[PDB]
């Protein structure tokens, strides 16, 4: 069993950079490609062995500025990554999705898929594929939904796990993020089996109030979102009490073929010293699973009904306490569940508890949660971007850019009445 | 003034000793205790308690040696005559199965190759 | 609701319960501790006789290397000496086979690392004109087998190598009888020493001189082949990783390892040339040195 | 087919190591018990030389 | 002679399989590489019927294991009793179902159940006369739901005469693991209800408050629950292995057991389980393992009795015991709580007694009552399918690999049937 | 006393003949150095089937290797077993054939033959009482088929009243190495047809198919395959070289499987064949081998009997066994599988018993089945050569050289009959 990952964008390259690192030094990689000194399988499904010693990584960067992917081939892994699977074009797709969707991904997706092919062919047991991008950009968003719309016409049955960092509302790095955020929703929806959001409002805040550092950068953010990547795939990686694999979240969470959108939260988030400070219980961190204080996403489960919840665990737990603190979950009444389904938790458990990255912020825990929940405070985020979307789509601000690249108002006005019909369908199905 | 990732992302804290160190595999073991020490009962300090005989061995053939009474052998609540209770008939007149099936593992185990049948 | 949990010193809880239930398992090693069943202390006295300070012997005081002493054997190009663990032999009905590999990380000399010569009488069936040796010493292209010293139990005795010997043997490849990791002749240490499989044959490795040294006193330092004298097939270090209990070691098996170079043998043989009458030299994993003994005792006869 | 093989092979790896693993968790109960009675004897020193 | 062959379906019965399989050779004395090593020859002559002989000593198991992920086949040739297993036997598909009753029942099955369905063949005819199958699996997961009931369905139309016992775990809403644990469920058990001559319903839910309760533990693992189903699966089979003072056989107890063809469905328990801390206290003896045996406490279901009656039940004691204090003891539990019972059937009690007690124990008993009060059990399961399917929840991956929402349909007609008809006797 | 010639054609045939050889040798414990060295007096009595006592128990094996590219040759003298052929045997002309049927069969054979010839006459006429030829070779090559099939040719003019077998591989669409493979392949049909006794089709295809399902095996090379066929040629030749309790030599097979005189394209397989991680949880009875024996996947040619019918089959086996066993056995599975066997014969199914089994064995089998599924290979060779033939194409190279057009009719003609006289005996 293999799962292979791509990396779009000026975020995916960086999340993928730190996600990487924390692969090596889960599976003891050095960062020139071996191990110091066996058969053992369980690196297998991320890093292919080749020749003598050397393993090399089943990925796929690519971005469009060759800045951020050749600063990777200078960095401190150039002997890990090969030399092929870095993949730069030669100028940016600059905050447009239709330059990304047409103008140059129509001459480097063709490689990217003759590339990512020969990958899959290499592989064996090839579960899905993960991608890693942000909307808010244009390479990412264009390209990204190019490659997946190729790719799920190419495979289609493989699922396809996509970690997507969407824009917060009101910390914003950019200004067309609400028409490019719209434009990638708009194919993310019917290409995307599992698509799990990622904000920066809400990381940031929790940088802030866990790890209590107060100046972070988006190193911090990529390295936890690192964890949680690692934390979920961990059950494929080792033996543990009940391990769940790539398609049970697409069984278990996704009830109906359009409501594919997770929270996801991570817990605990402790740094040193308070390492020493708490005792590290199960109940205590099942709690701090829930709170809004601790979703990756900033928006309020409380104005919304769950539909389904999966938990990973990872370290030394057994069943018997996780069932009982999800019982004192489902008896208290803080939080509230789709009265339709009447069982909405999924456990799975794997014994190796995370590792620590030196240099890092986060401290050698016993045992970690990570929870990967449906609800539909979702369906009140994509509400939220769509009233800023159409206040700035009245004035046609900024529509000479797309329409030059070649695209028209009809792409805009069927993704307005998509996020619409969503809209719809989410307050539908909360009933 | 350094590149931000090339700030963050070093050698020194790899590679040395704590790709070891973060190797563990803690998740191979996780030992359970043993299924049987659940369900026995008696005292830990001598080994299980195997009944291996039945009443039919017992009294009509007499198994063992002092012929009392039919009911001594079955399991009282009283010490009075739960110390005599035998566990085990031990002799031949067991084991004459297994010294016929140890000469067939015999037998099959030391074997010549060229020996015709008719000879 | 949930509370802390807390060390079975305190008494807390069910503190009674979790310090009994630890009560018992440890009663249970305690027992096995004094039966001496315990899977630690099992293979603990396999451990001290299989690796055991241990003296190679020679014969007499001449350096050529003797029937009946203790010898080691080691690949020029690797050190990594040969020997095979009596236990862990293989598990069948009629098989006493054992398995016997090279160890890179023990290379001094143990108990189970040494071979002893023994001479091999040909019987009476056998229709092998055999070249008369009459002294002790062990010549080129003479029939020898290899014992080893034992290391599960008993003493050495000069030809005997225990009451239950075990030499080196090699079956062609079989079904049944194939190197467990790769595709060649297993090598193992059988207890049928008087089948002719045990039978092993030291050549010089060059081919041109080994006709001109047919009969000559082997040396100890010298690079010789071993090479089975049933099968007529050298032996070689597989290096395929095996994982006895001892270390990692390396597969042994009989390969011809030659090196595809042609040779126009039907071209030579019919045009009755010299150079025709020769087998293509073997490559470097083939050369074994036999290390000897340097004090002097002889073995205790049978 | 061929995978099954290769798996064959990694199994009696894992088999060895399983067996070195449990042989080491004993010595690791038995010098738990070691170094609490030396503790004992520890502080049974230091209380009569005071 | 009278054979048990032995299918072990998913994560949950290779698990369990092997915990059952440690137990067994324990009790005939062979080592964990393979030969016989015990002492008595009462252990040998009833060998043939979970073994067979190799060569030399050399015992195999008659199990067939199946399963779609190598996860649980690495971890059963690892541990101790791992060896043992005949490696033709591991037949073992590659894919993965996960929570998927149709991919485990139309998509893997059609090219995996035909591949051990030559073993299971092979495996029945190199025996001579079969007392039956014994297959332990789940109903909440893919790989042994519905990989394991399709299995059952092809068994059935091909060896109508043997019998059939079926371990299955099945899903609590307290103890709830997966999401579509009622979509599982649900056609699992309406494909049980016409193809298992009879099932012993498992649950985890029950097995905890056992293990808080009486056997007092702090962790309680999968390896402890699955050692007690391990002892409840050798104390059923105990009176093919072992002679004793009255022998019952699996038809023997089928019989005394069922009576109409859809009435089925078992709770069992077993005794004694005590805690450590109080081993001592207990005498052994059967008022004091009778008392154990009948309290609501020690079932392995989530179903009170006393919220219901029992139709029939029975005892299976192993030991060297007087049959007078057996029957003296079951008519006065029977009249005593004589409302427990059914009044159209005199005498609701079968016994048996075999003289092998279990390895480490004196003497033990093993109880197995059809009661009413399951129907508890199913209308908790069938209320939250009522729920899923009038949404038509979850339904798309179900409906786009060849089921279609009939099927639901009938699954729900047999259940609410199915608890209509023991509300019935009630 | 009755001798066995033995004649390897092609790379094929040197490879094959080979292996063959070091098996054989091994057998009767004869080194590569040529001398006897064997413990029990059994094998000194029936070896000069195969051997000649030169000087000092120097015995050279009655084999002649036969090709014209001394790439084969060099590989045969290279490792062991090189220095037991005699270099007077080692027959080998210069030129080159290449794949090319007119080649080996017009221009080369016209000046290889008369030193074939003289080698082979001389050393038959150097023993008795010959039994027969043996024949290996190949029927995609070029100096393999188009000297073999000229060699049969000449012998069968010369010595009409003795044996003759022919192992022959012929290729397969799913393993095909060379493009002119139906070019050969029917033209050298088409001569066996009219010249051998009886042939033994083997083939790659299914050789593959049993290392990867029942060997279990890593890397395949042609050594291992070239095992298995040795295997079958010994298991052919026991009976002579081995007193049993029921002799079938080769006349007495050939007479008990070839009821009409074109149909001798036997099917082969052998037994028993499993893993070395699967060699210990088995045991060795007759059932045994008779499940694995007539198993459909097991036959070492690539046509499924099962779409055909078994019109006469020959089992041997070796070892100390229960005639009964052997002969029940037999009639279990002709009456059970009563629709796979022909009806105007009863009892199909010759059987015969040697005491001493292959080294390293304790009991094996080797199967010999006379189908009507062969005709299924026929046309799967022959629609390709008659695909090619439409368009003439690679036709020149042969046309060019001596042969016509109307050899390439007659040679699928002959082709076709065969298919549909045995479609018609079916
Ligand atoms: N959390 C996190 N977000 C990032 C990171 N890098 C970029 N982003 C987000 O990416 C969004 C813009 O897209 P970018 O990835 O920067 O650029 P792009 O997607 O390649 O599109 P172009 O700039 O047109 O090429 C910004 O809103 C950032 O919030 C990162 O390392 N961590
Ligand atoms: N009693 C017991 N139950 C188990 C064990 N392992 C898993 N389970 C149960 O199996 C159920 C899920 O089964 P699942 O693994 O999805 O079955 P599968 O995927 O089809 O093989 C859960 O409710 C677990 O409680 C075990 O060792 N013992
Ligand atoms: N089984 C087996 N087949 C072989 C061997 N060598 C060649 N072949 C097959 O023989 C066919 C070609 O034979 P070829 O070498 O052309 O015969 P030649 O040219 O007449 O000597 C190919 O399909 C090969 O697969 C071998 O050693 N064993
Ligand atoms: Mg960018």
């Known amino acids: 069993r293999e799962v292979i990952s791509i990396h779009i964008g000026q975020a995916g390259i960086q999340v993928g950079n730190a996600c990487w690192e924390l692969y090596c030094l889960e599976h003891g990689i050095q960062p020139d490609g071996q191990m110091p000194s066996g058969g053992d399988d369980a690196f297998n499904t991320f890093f292919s062995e080749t020749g003598a010693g050397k393993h090399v990584p089943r990925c796929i960067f690519l971005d469009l500025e060759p800045t951020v992917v050749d600063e990777v081939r200078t960095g401190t892994y150039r002997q890990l990554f090969h030399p092929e699977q870095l993949i730069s074009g030669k100028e940016d797709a600059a905050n447009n999705f239709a330059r990304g969707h047409y103008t140059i991904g129509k001459e480097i997706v063709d490689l990217a898929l003759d590339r990512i092919r020969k990958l899959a062919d290499n592989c064996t047991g090839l579960q899905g594929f993960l991608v890693f991008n942000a909307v808010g950009g244009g390479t990412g968003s264009g390209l990204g939904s190019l490659l997946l719309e190729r790719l799920s016409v190419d495979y289609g049955k493989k699922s396809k796990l996509g970690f997507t960092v969407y824009p917060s509302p009101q910390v914003s790095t950019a200004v067309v993020e609400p028409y490019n955020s719209v434009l990638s929703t708009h194919s993310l929806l019917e290409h995307t089996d599992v698509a799990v959001m990622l904000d920066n409002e809400a990381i940031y805040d929790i940088c802030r109030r866990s790890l209590d550092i107060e100046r972070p950068t988006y190193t911090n953010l990529n390295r936890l979102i690192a964890q949680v990547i690692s934390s979920l795939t961990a059950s494929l990686r080792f033996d543990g009490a009940l391990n769940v694999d790539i398609t049970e979240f697409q069984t278990n969470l996704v009830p109906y073929p359009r409501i594919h959108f997770m929270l996801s939260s991570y817990a605990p988030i402790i740094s040193a010293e308070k390492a020493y400070h708490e005792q590290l219980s199960v109940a205590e961190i099942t709690n701090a699973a829930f709170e809004p204080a601790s979703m990756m996403v900033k928006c309020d489960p409380r104005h919304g009904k769950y539909m389904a919840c999966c938990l990973m665990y990872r370290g030394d737990v057994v069943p018997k306490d996780v069932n009982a603190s999800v019982a004192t979950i489902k008896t208290k009444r803080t939080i509230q569940f789709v009265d339709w389904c009447p069982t909405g938790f999924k456990c799975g458990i794997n014994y190796q508890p995370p590792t620590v990255v030196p240099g890092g912020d986060l401290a050698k825990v016993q045992r970690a949660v990570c929870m990967i929940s449906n609800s539909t405070a979702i369906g009140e985020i994509f509400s939220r971007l769509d009233h800023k979307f159409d206040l700035m789509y009245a004035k046609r601000a900024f529509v000479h850019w797309y329409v030059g690249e070649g695209m028209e108002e009809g792409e805009f006005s069927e993704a307005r009445e998509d996020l619409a019909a969503l809209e719809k369908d989410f307050e539908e199905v909360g009933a | 003034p350094t590149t931000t990732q090339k700030r963050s992302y070093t050698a020194e804290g790899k590679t040395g000793e704590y790709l070891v160190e973060a190797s563990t595999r803690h998740d191979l073991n996780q030992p359970g205790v043993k299924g049987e020490l659940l369900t026995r009962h008696g005292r830990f300090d001598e080994p299980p308690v195997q009944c291996l005989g039945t009443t039919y061995q017992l009294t009509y053939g007499r198994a063992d040696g002092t012929d009392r009474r039919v009911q001594s052998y079955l399991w009282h609540g009283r010490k009075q005559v739960d110390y005599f209770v035998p566990h085990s008939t031990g002799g031949p007149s067991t084991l004459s199965l297994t010294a016929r099936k140890q000469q067939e593992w015999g037998t099959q185990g030391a074997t010549d190759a060229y020996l015709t049948t008719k000879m | 609701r949930d509370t802390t949990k807390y060390n079975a010193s305190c008494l807390i809880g069910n503190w009674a319960e979790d310090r009994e239930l630890q009560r018992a398992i440890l009663k249970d090693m305690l027992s096995k501790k004094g039966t001496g069943t315990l899977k630690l202390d099992a293979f603990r006295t396999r451990m001290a006789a299989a690796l055991s300070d241990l003296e190679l012997t020679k014969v007499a005081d001449d350096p050529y290397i003797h029937f009946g002493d203790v010898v080691q054997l080691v690949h020029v190009d690797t050190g990594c000496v040969l020997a095979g663990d009596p236990a862990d032999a293989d598990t069948r009905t009629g098989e006493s086979t054992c398995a016997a590999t090279a160890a890179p990380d023990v290379r001094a000399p143990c108990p189970r690392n040494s071979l002893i010569l023994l001479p091999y009488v040909p019987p009476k069936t056998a229709t092998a004109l055999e070249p008369p040796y009459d002294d002790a010493i062990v010549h080129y292209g003479q029939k020898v087998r290899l014992a080893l010293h034992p290391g599960a139990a008993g003493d050495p005795v000069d030809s005997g190598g225990g009451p239950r010997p075990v030499c080196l043997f090699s079956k062609p490849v079989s079904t049944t009888h194939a190197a467990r990791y790769s595709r060649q002749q297993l090598v193992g240490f059988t207890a049928r020493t008087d089948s002719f499989d045990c039978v092993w044959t030291v050549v010089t490795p060059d081919p041109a001189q080994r006709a001109a040294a047919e009969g000559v006193e082997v040396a100890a330092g010298a690079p010789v082949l071993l090479v089975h004298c049933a099968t007529q097939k050298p032996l070689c270090l597989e290096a395929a990783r095996y994982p006895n209990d001892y270390g990692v070691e390396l597969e042994v098996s009989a390969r011809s390892a030659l090196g595809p170079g042609l040779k126009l043998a039907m071209e030579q043989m019919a045009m009755g040339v010299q150079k025709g009458f020769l087998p293509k030299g073997e490559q470097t994993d083939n050369y074994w040195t036999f290390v000897a003994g340097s004090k002097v005792e002889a073995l205790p006869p049978p | ?50 | 002679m009278r054979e048990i062959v032995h299918i072990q379906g998913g994560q949950c019965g290779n698990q369990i399989g092997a915990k059952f399989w440690e137990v067994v050779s324990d009790e005939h004395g062979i080592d964990p590489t393979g030969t016989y090593h015990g002492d008595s020859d009462l252990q040998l002559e009833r060998i043939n019927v979970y073994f067979n002989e190799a060569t030399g000593g050399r015992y195999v198991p008659r199990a067939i294991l199946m399963d779609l992920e190598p996860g649980t086949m690495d971890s059963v040739r690892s541990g101790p009793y791992g060896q043992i297993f005949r490696p033709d036997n591991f037949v073992f598909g590659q894919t993965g179902a996960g929570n998927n009753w149709a991919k485990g029942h139309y998509t893997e099955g059609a090219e995996l159940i035909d591949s051990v369905l030559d073993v299971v063949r092979k495996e029945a005819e190199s025996c001579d006369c079969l007392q039956g199958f014994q297959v332990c699996h789940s109903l909440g997961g893919g790989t042994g739901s519905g990989m394991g009931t399709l299995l059952i369905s092809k068994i059935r139309e091909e060896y109508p005469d043997r019998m059939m016992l079926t371990f299955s775990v099945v899903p609590s809403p307290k103890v709830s693991d997966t999401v579509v644990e009622p979509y599982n469920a649900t056609l699992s058990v309406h494909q049980l209800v016409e193809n298992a001559d009879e099932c012993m319903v498992l649950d985890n839910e029950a097995l905890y408050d056992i293990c808080f309760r009486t056997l007092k533990l702090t962790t309680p693992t999968f390896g402890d629950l699955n050692h007690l189903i391990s002892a409840v699966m050798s104390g059923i089979t105990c009176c093919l292995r072992f002679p004793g003072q009255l022998n019952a056989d699996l038809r023997k107890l089928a019989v005394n057991l069922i009576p109409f063809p859809r009435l089925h469905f078992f709770m069992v328990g077993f005794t004694p389980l005590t805690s450590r801390g109080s081993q001592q206290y207990r005498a052994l003896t059967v008022p004091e393992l009778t008392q154990q045996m009948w309290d609501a406490k020690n079932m392995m279901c989530a179903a009170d009795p006393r919220h219901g009656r029992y139709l029939t039940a029975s005892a299976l004691f192993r030991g060297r015991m007087s049959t007078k204090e057996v029957d003296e003891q079951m008519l006065n539990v029977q009249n005593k709580n004589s409302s427990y019972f059914v009044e159209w059937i005199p005498n609701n009690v079968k016994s048996s007694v075999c003289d092998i007690p279990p390895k480490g124990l004196k003497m033990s008993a093993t109880f197995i009552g059809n009661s009413t009060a399951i129907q508890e059990m199913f209308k908790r399961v069938s209320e939250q399918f009522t729920a899923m399917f009038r949404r038509k929840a979850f339904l798309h991956w179900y409906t786009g690999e060849g089921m279609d929402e009939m099927e639901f349909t009938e699954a729900e007609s047999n259940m609410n049937d199915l608890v209509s008809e023991y509300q019935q006797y009630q």
């Open chain 4, 1 to 50: 087919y061929d995978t099954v093989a290769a798996n064959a092979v990694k199994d009696d790896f894992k088999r060895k190591g399983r067996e070195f693993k449990e042989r080491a968790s004993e010595a690791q109960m038995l010098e738990s018990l070691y170094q609490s009675e030396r503790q004992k004897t520890l502080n049974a020193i230091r209380a009569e030389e005071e």
